[PDB]
Amino acid sequence: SWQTYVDTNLVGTGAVTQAAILGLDGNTWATSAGFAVTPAQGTTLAGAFNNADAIRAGGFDLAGVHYVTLRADDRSIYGKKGSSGVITVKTSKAILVGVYNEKIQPGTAANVVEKLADYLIGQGF
């Protein structure tokens, strides 16, 4: 279930506060209650997986928070807003978004999203 991935496999682990799963068209597949990645925000993310020009210099927006880009490649885009941040990992057909707060070890949030991506690819996603 897409809802389960988000609730249980991401948020449920406590390494991430809010999580969403998107489509390469930037449309949300499932989201944690109260977390909202807009289409517009979504289409920008996807786009950056292709060309990270925009994003590398201007940062990006996820549900009202503007993050500055720490890392951007074909598989991973990392955002940081002070002691907070977001880990996005593009899979074959989807994009994982794992937002974390100052109460979470960044190293841990990244390792959890990155590993769920690995498991999801292996399933055909």
**Quick one: resolution in A?**
2.0
Q: What is the CATH number of the domain that holds 102?
A: 3.30.450.30
Whose tokens are 């909202």? That residue is 36
Method by which the model was determined: X-ray
Say if CB 71 and CB 55 are below 8 A apart. Answer: no
Residue 26: count of CB within 10 angstroms of its CB: 18
Range of the domain at 102: 1-125
Q: How many domains does the chain have?
A: 1
- CB count in 10 Å sphere of residue 98: 28
Residue 113 CA to its chain's centroid (Å): 8
Whole-number Å distance between alpha carbons of 26 and 70: 21
Q: Which residues does residue 76 pair with via DSSP β-bridges, in sequence order? A: 89
Give the pair of three-digit tokens for residue 121: 């690819």
